Amino acid sequence: LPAHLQQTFSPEEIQFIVENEPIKIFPRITWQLITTDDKALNNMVAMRSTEVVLWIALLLKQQSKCSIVAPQWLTTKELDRKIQYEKTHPDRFSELPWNWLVLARILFNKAKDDFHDPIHELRGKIQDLREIRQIKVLKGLKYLNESHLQLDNLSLLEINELRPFITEIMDKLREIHTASL
Template identity: 50%
Template sequence: MVLPTHLRQRLTPAEIQFLCENENVTILPRYSMPKVELIGNKIPALKALKRIEVPLWTALILKSQAKCNIIAPLWLNTDYLKKMYEQEKKYLEMFSSLPWNWLEMSKILIARAADDLSDPSTQLRSIIKDLREIRQLKSKRGLRELNESNIQLNGLSLMELNELRPFALSVMEKMRQLHDSVQTTNDQASDESEPDL
């Protein structure tokens, strides 16, 4: 697929969501079903009302056919997300510990399995939006401390890193060039000041 230059440096949100669908989630099957062998993957045998982990994409297919309920991850409830929001506000120098794919997973589950969630989807969307905004603000503040050799943004999700990547890489490249030019100037100055032997 031919993409504009500004999109070649990162994954699209749809690609990140696709990757997220390979993450395992717990389901509660409504029916028993034999094991299914796929290329590169196996769906285990399902027994009615016995919890089991399957890839998210499998859970979504079974859910659309009314063959299972998806058990929401422990972190996908308003109490936990509010606690993470308070941590984000309290600790301005670090990010709260949310799963690697919390944004994508929450978006998918709210859109396609809202009836399986313990809290109303409107409340979840609201707190997720607040959490995302404060984390974006913190990550932008963190970019001020960039240098040419590394960047430390521990605790960010794949989607958050993907949004920052083009900007951070271009800034780091400019800083590296600036550092190299200053180093070259300093080397030339020291060569000129040394006496000839």
């Protein structure tokens, strides 16, 4: 009996999910281990980038034995083209990593000192792109009908927050209408 939530995912569970996405790293180190699902790696070379899963990068970052790379889409100069492209298409939600909220929480807790110009900038940027996008969702949510919605490109977290609401009142709405014919 899962109790909470249960129909929607838990906010934590979507991080539990996203940490399964691989991203590049800069190992300080120069057994085996096969583990199960990793496939990697031959002993990591210091000052050499390589591709590994996230939860291990985070794990090895707590010990500061590795320096995570910043994603090419996580930058303020990069985000600028994205909010510029977002203000100008009030309908569509543009192009999203789909994890961007949760990576934006996770990579800022520890890895923060690795980013170039992380301070007081990107958080200001993504807290914004997580603003106009949210209100655009609430103003795109007036057009609700059964059964269709284009939620286009939308974050996993954004999906998860509003899920019970939409997929509940769709189940009051479509419920009268299917049944009245």
